[PDB]
């Protein structure tokens, strides 16, 4: 999944502050 | 005179025990609307809707175990009922006498349906066949096999082409009445289907299951027209409006929901009932809804036309 | 030696995984 690996940082940012 | 959804009458302690079925029929010659209810207290009761009031006319007995289904004829003044002991009884609504009885063994005769001509009774069976009994004959003329499990609900299309059946595994089966051949076998749901119905034009098939979902099918192609949700528990009964643009459903969550088939959205919900609402039906012209449930109550709801 | 057929089971069924709304 090429697009998935680019979104790892964004999802980590989302979850870091939940 | 603006018309809005709202309760109009409420008969408390209608039966000793839970009311498990209802049926609304309109008779032209008598010009009096009739309601037939069956209950787990082994009693059938015939009420007349007049002057915005329910008045008991007959109280018919004979069923051994709970009465599971009660139906009326669209033209004749006849009614039918089935009990948990698989006994079927025909009642003359004019005099309140038992026309005849059919002993369907220990397993057959779960739920009843009147054919459009009111010349037959269709009932699902434990083995997986829909047996057909002559109203005048009183005998099993033949049966259509599904090769499935317990059939919980049965329906007759108003035009008489097909009779539908819903199984305990969620599978739907549509038979052609003319040739008695299994037209379609659809996946349907994964939980038991306790009630399915046809549209007044026989174009749509609406089925209800324990998963809380109401599925619409186009019988012509047997394709899934849509899925409706909003009930918090089992859906126990569905019934189409005469206007053909609406239908009503009931559920274990103590609510009766009226859905619009066009917009596929629940247009109203009644929370009056205090227990499982087992039956819901429309009147002849679609301006009333009758509902019955485990709280032993009969509720009438007005509806705009 | 006749009675209602019912096997009594002492069950310990865990709750489903919680999925409450998240706080930011």
């Amino acid at each position: 999944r090429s697009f998935v690996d680019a979104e790892v940082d964004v999802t980590r940012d989302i979850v870091s502050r939940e | 005179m603006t018309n809005q959804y709202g309760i109009l009458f409420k008969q408390e302690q209608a039966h000793d025990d839970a009311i498990w079925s209802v049926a609304w029929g309109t008779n032209k010659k008598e010009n009096s609307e009739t309601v037939v209810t069956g209950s787990l207290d082994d009693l059938v009761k015939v009420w007349k809707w007049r002057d915005e009031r329910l008045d008991l006319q007959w109280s018919l007995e004979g069923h051994q175990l709970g009465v599971v289904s009660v139906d009326i004829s669209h033209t004749l003044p006849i009614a039918a009922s089935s009990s948990l002991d698989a006994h079927i009884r025909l009642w003359d609504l004019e005099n309140g006498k038992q026309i005849k009885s059919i002993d369907a063994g220990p397993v057959d005769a779960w739920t009843l349906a009147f054919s459009p001509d009111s010349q037959y009774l269709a009932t699902g069976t434990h083995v997986g066949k829909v047996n057909i009994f002559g109203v005048e004959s009183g005998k099993k003329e033949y049966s259509l096999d599904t090769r499935g499990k317990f059939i919980l609900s049965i329906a007759y299309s108003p035009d008489g082409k097909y009779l539908a059946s819903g199984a305990i595994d969620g599978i739907i089966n549509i038979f052609d009445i003319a040739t008695g051949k299994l037209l379609h076998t659809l996946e349907g749901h994964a939980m038991p289907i306790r009630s399915l119905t046809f549209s007044p034009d026989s174009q749509l098939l609406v089925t209800a299951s324990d998963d809380g979902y109401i599925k619409i099918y186009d019988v012509q192609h047997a394709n899934l027209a849509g899925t409706l949700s909003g009930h918090a528990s089992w859906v126990l009964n569905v019934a189409f409006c005469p206007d053909d643009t609406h239908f009503v459903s009931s559920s274990s969550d103590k609510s009766v929901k009226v859905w619009d088939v066009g917009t596929r959205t629940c247009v109203h919900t009644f929370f009056d009932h205090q227990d499982q609402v087992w039956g819901v039906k429309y009147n002849g012209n679609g301006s009333k809804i009758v509902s019955v449930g485990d709280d032993q109550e009969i509720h009438i709801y007005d509806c705009p036309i | 030696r006749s009675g209602v057929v019912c096997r009594v089971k002492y069950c310990n069924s865990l709750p489903d995984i919680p999925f409450d709304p998240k706080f930011i």
Binding site: V4, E7, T11, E18 | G170, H231 | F19
Partner: protein
Amino acid sequence: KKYFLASLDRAKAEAEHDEHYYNAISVTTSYNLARLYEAMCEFHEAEKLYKNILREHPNYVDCYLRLGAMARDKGNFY
């Protein structure tokens, strides 16, 4: 429902001030609203919202698990 919709509206309204932060705030609020729709038995809207989240944020595990839970609730265990 009112507050979740207001939160989504507010995050959208003030997104220009900081798009990156408000996008993540809206993602969490959107998941909350989908979970609410599940609560209100609007499983079609909840499923559509979960899929919308998953389409843009394929790393949101909770959305996958909610779709699976809804499928299991439907009775489709596969």
